Amino acid sequence: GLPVFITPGSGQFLTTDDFQSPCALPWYHPTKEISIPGEVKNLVEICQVDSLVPINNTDT
């Protein structure tokens, strides 16, 4: 096989990694995305929403 050699950072799992991976369920096909309203791409659109402060944070 091609001569290869292995760097550290191999063989770990990182919960914040980024990679391709093999399929558990080959030949499957997902349901189509119907045009559901209420699209979103980022958290900033939620940031743009005015929400109330619970300004008056006391027991009473």
Binding site: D18, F19, Q20, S21, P22, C23, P26, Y28, P30, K41
Partner: peptide, 25 residues
């Protein structure tokens, strides 16, 4: 082709497209 945000070429190789699990913006 090369990566639009960047300075290098890399592209899929694993078999079925859904299995990639890594998207552009």
């Amino acid at each position: 082709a090369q990566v639009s945000r960047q300075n290098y070429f890399n592209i899929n190789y694993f078999k079925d497209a859904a299995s990639n699990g890594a998207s552009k913006l």
